[PDB]
Amino acid sequence: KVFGRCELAAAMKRHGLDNYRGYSLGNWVCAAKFESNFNTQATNRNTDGSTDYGILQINSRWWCNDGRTPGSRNLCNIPCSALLSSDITASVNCAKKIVSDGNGMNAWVAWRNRCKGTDVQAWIRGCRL
After folding, report:
1. CATH 1.10.472.10 is held by the domain 1-129
2. What's the rounded Cα separation, in Å, for the pair 61 and 44?
3. Angle value at C-alpha 93, between 47 and 104, nearest 5 degrees
4. How far apart are CA 85 and CA 18, in angstroms?
5. Residue 101 annotated as lining a ligand binding site
6. Residues designated as active site
7. How far is residue 52's CA from residue 57's CA, in Å, rounded to a whole number?
8. For an engineered disulfide with 26, which of 50, 57, 70, 120 has Cβ 3.0 to 4.6 Å away?
9. In the chain, domain spans
10. Distance of CA 126 to CAs 4, 7, 80, 101, Å?
């Protein structure tokens, strides 16, 4: 599924991401935009044998199990395929653990490259949240 910007914004706020660990909703929508362009089916194979899954591109090496990643750990205790559903619940709860893993949102490279230090409030424009 492909979310509309405000539609995803609402869904994320509904799952408690607004200001989670001090990160405004704008940060999460912006991260989603550049990590997967709001596409829940998004997947990116990495040259290290791992794969990034879903709207927030969660990595298979440490967070989810896709059964084909060497020395993988399943810290979020879920199959990676669950991160490709139309409902973001699974991705959000896993993301909540990642953001608290000691690097803030720096865990998402696209956030770091395109959202960090920017006026992320714009990503929430027009939204009746």
Report:
1. no
2. 13
3. 65
4. 21
5. yes
6. 35, 52
7. 5
8. 120
9. 1-129
10. 12, 11, 33, 32
